[PDB]
Design a protein around this ligand. Structure first.
Ligand SMILES: NC(=O)C1=CN([C@@H]2O[C@H](COP(=O)(O)OP(=O)(O)OC[C@H]3O[C@@H](n4cnc5c(N)ncnc54)[C@H](O)[C@@H]3O)[C@@H](O)[C@H]2O)C=CC1
Ligand SMILES: NC(=O)C1=CN([C@@H]2O[C@H](COP(=O)(O)OP(=O)(O)OC[C@H]3O[C@@H](n4cnc5c(N)ncnc54)[C@H](O)[C@@H]3O)[C@@H](O)[C@H]2O)C=CC1
Ligand SMILES: NC(=O)C1=CN([C@@H]2O[C@H](COP(=O)(O)OP(=O)(O)OC[C@H]3O[C@@H](n4cnc5c(N)ncnc54)[C@H](O)[C@@H]3O)[C@@H](O)[C@H]2O)C=CC1
Ligand SMILES: NC(=O)C1=CN([C@@H]2O[C@H](COP(=O)(O)OP(=O)(O)OC[C@H]3O[C@@H](n4cnc5c(N)ncnc54)[C@H](O)[C@@H]3O)[C@@H](O)[C@H]2O)C=CC1
Ligand SMILES: C[C@]12CCC(O)CC1CC[C@@H]1[C@@H]2CC[C@]2(C)C(=O)CC[C@@H]12
Ligand SMILES: C[C@]12CCC(O)CC1CC[C@@H]1[C@@H]2CC[C@]2(C)C(=O)CC[C@@H]12
Ligand SMILES: C[C@]12CCC(O)CC1CC[C@@H]1[C@@H]2CC[C@]2(C)C(=O)CC[C@@H]12
Ligand SMILES: C[C@]12CCC(O)CC1CC[C@@H]1[C@@H]2CC[C@]2(C)C(=O)CC[C@@H]12
Lengths: 244, 244, 244, 244
């Protein structure tokens, strides 16, 4: 409570799912949040309940002009920008043969290029403020592979790597960059998937707030000495070997 | 300010350095702490200025009988045990040729067996309580190697592995096990080492409280979905490649 | 000698550098090689001194039609296709701020999409034979980060991930997929870089044949039980922590 | 045939299982092998069928004096020592509670200290010769955890770490140190385990020769630029996420 007081955050894909949960969790901790998405109806809806501590903006992470608009909104409406949560992303599947090249390009644009564009857009205000925290949402699919999940796996691994190179470059400016790797979380992106698809040590899927707690920790100054690192919140899946 | 209220913790090697910092940080968050060490003078000293919320006990992590005594103290004095911070450890160096077999055995006993004994000692009360968090202190030397640091590297890698196997086994009982890997921290164990020995992105060594913040996070229920994972707090060292 | 006898291989970017070395090394071991590139003069030149054992074809890894032509050449000229070495790649640098979006897209197309296209192109003939070995050339930049190397790092991490997902999917068909991660190698891509830029245990840069030896091993049936794995040939760089 | 001609190797635990397979594979490639174990009957038996290419010696890897005797045998009988294969090891299981402290100590002595003693014993002759190759046999249990496998997991992770620190230290002397991580292999140590206990991409357990092929590669000069690295030969297990 009051752990993010004075912090301004930008969250991509915050109209629903984990993104929405992150917005709510950060506001509850005293932060001012600008969240963007492409689902304007839902976005404006919850922008109404968070009232004056949040602002919704239309943001297609593949459009650099929209990223700039999102950043300008944060800076002029709240005075600055200290946190970026690259959460927007999509999921598509398909075996090597019947996986469309267009789906491949689409997921690269959103899941990878979108994350890169967000980082380019927030460095200026963060460098001026001399402090900042960028949180990239990857997944355990960015740690190991899965059948018929080539585009998703490739981009989640890429986001993991992009996190490291940018962390090294921005470190001297006081900006931290870390990646979060969650396992199965109950959201509209995976409501069609059985909750026990992964072998976990805790024996259950995660509630979105459980990932949000990690977002708050990484956004706060409590995690001041962690940068370029992978934070896993998967209930123990990648900690064990695949058995039958 | 009250993130650990109602939690009872046992910290090994808490008389000084990071251990002491963890004790203070957890008490400040509302936890009751039992800390043990072999430096009784210093231990009793700070137990006095924490008298109401903490208890000091003599604890040589290589002696199972002392671990049991430490656990009994926590349970009878505070009603239970929910957190274990395996922090006690030593550091010795030497090349392959002139590294004494006795130093090798000594570091294995303290840094590895000591950690195992602590886990065996706390599982009973934690399993009864139905909830628990075990935090094993490894290091980045448990992620990559260093010249003339064979005993330390071997044990820190082992602690990292022990964290995973125990997390899988204890998960069903509601107990989480995670490892922390810090880089250079300002403590008596490394005050003879130049603060910039490691290439970091932040360009500085860490203050012990920076590692304590991560201990609090892992001890709290905020990290409910993280288990068997490595949490790195090294200022970016392992995120980059070794350059000249 | 004769370790690859009866094997037909396709090597992308084989007109010079490591690619050329791989072609020569595999021919010396009894394999028939079809190598493609965009440097036609050099390509036809060495195709001439390798006469009956190799065939050169123009191949821009970003063009699916050219990949098909390359595969058809291998199958009709040599009877089949058992090995694919995704070696083609480019290197560009730049900081988050002054790194052109066009350079970013270019490296994604060649280093990542190019690798994906190669895999899609060879699965048919390999699945019919019920055997095959795909070797993806990543780098240690696909294991850790580097300043001003965002596009390269992102794609090399992605290739590492793509290797795992495809290995799991193709495993049942008898096809193995592995990634190679070399450190500094003496080639035209890095002749402007000081040979001791990386901290290595061997104290030297690698000769391209040293990486080719690993390519032969992975192409042969000797490595029959290795798939979806990372093979590091960096002289010890990623095995140690970055010191000053 | 003749890939290890002129090389002298020392293999611990070579009387049966993978160790025996390594001895046979290396002899077939032209190497002279000294293998030790504690199963003298079986050891002398196969020392007979290999003739003068192989010498058997009694060797308890926990006894430094016996290691010295093994090394002296190699040097005086064959003129030198260029390869060490730390293969000897044991397997015991048990949950945290009912796992005997004696079993814990026993596995630490054999699986970890035994490996360290072997390295200390061979550095002298290798440093004089200008180069050498040390191959430490870990396992995928040294990469991820398993329930009721605490001693085994801890030591296999430690061997993985010991491989890196020693590789960095010995690199300047021309000595390479690498670790091998196999999955399920058909040997007496695991003949009671169902061949499909692990989820693999290849859908089968490995034949010991498949791991021996990797030992030969690492023992030969073909792998000249690989050191301090993990070589996985697990049929794809650790490349994928644990599913149900
Ligand atoms: N659901 C799960 O189990 C897991 C999800 N993740 C990651 O977490 C992130 C969010 O996941 P969920 O909330 O579960 O998914 P979700 O589908 O609920 O939400 C993703 C959001 O991104 C927005 N979005 C999509 N394309 C966009 C674009 N071009 N520009 C801006 N916004 C766009 C969508 O409208 C949606 O609100 C993604 O990066 C996902 O890959 C990671 C691990 C597990
Ligand atoms: N100092 C550093 O830069 C880093 C330290 N670490 C780890 O953090 C932990 C604590 O480190 P520091 O506070 O810096 O060290 P420290 O030397 O300040 O404290 C270690 C404490 O353990 C106690 N201790 C030693 N042997 C013991 C035994 N057999 N039984 C019980 N207590 C014993 C010591 O008396 C001391 O109070 C260790 O596990 C260490 O490996 C990890 C990364 C970096
Ligand atoms: N040079 C080094 O130190 C290291 C190189 N690598 C990787 O090894 C691979 C080969 O590297 P080098 O031989 O050193 O580089 P190089 O520059 O000598 O050769 C790359 C080759 O790819 C060809 N190529 C480029 N774009 C192409 C396209 N669109 N279609 C077809 N061919 C194309 C080039 O013409 C050239 O022959 C690359 O994937 C590189 O990232 C990895 C680690 C270290
Ligand atoms: N069997 C498997 O699936 C896997 C085995 N490994 C590792 O490979 C190595 C050999 O495995 P296996 O051949 O399958 O086991 P094994 O039981 O067939 O052979 C181990 C050998 O070591 C010898 N030995 C035992 N204690 C010794 C001591 N104190 N000093 C000297 N020799 C001693 C034994 O007599 C035996 O011949 C071990 O390090 C094991 O952990 C790794 C991954 C999988
Ligand atoms: C939902 C999950 C599991 C959680 C997540 O973040 C993404 C995916 C996407 C691909 C799915 C995987 C479960 C296993 C599937 C269902 C395979 O068997 C074919 C496609 C795979
Ligand atoms: C202090 C540090 C760095 C922080 C830490 O937790 C442990 C050690 C122990 C061995 C040291 C290493 C710095 C580099 C040293 C000084 C080598 O050059 C020889 C022994 C090595
Ligand atoms: C050549 C190497 C090292 C070998 C390789 O495969 C790629 C690169 C590309 C970026 C370079 C890096 C050396 C360090 C550099 C020079 C940084 O200081 C700015 C750009 C970086
Ligand atoms: C054989 C194998 C699998 C191959 C290996 O190198 C060691 C072990 C040892 C512990 C076993 C594991 C299969 C799963 C087991 C059977 C658990 O369910 C309890 C003990 C575990």
């Amino acid at each position: 409570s009051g752990r993010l007081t004075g912090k301004v955050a930008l969250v991509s894909g915050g109209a629903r799912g984990m993104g929405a949960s992150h917005v709510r969790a950060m506001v509850a901790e005293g932060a001012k949040v600008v969240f963007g998405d492409i689902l304007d109806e839902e976005g404006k809806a919850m922008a109404a309940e968070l009232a004056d501590a949040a602002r919704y903006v239309h943001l297609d992470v593949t459009q650099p002009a929209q990223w700039k608009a999102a950043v300008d909104t944060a800076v002029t409406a709240f005075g600055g920008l200290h946190v970026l949560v690259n959460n927007a992303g999509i999921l598509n599947i398909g075996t090597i043969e019947d996986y469309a090249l267009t789906e491949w390009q689409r997921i690269l644009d959103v899941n990878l290029t979108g994350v890169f564009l967000g980082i380019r857009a927030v460095v200026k205000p963060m460098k001026e403020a001399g402090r900042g925290s960028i949180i990239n949402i990857s997944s355990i699919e960015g740690l190991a592979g899965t059948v018929a999940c080539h585009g998703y796996t490739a981009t989640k691994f890429a986001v993991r790597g992009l996190t490291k190179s940018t962390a090294l470059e921005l470190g001297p400016s006081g900006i931290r960059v870390n990646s979060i790797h969650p396992g199965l979380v109950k959201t509209p992106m995976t409501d069609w998937v059985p909750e026990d698809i992964f072998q976990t040590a805790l024996g259950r899927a995660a509630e979105p707030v459980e990932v949000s707690n990690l977002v708050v920790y990484l956004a706060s100054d409590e995690s001041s000495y962690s940068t370029g690192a992978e934070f896993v919140v998967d209930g123990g899946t990648v900690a064990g070997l695949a058995h039958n």
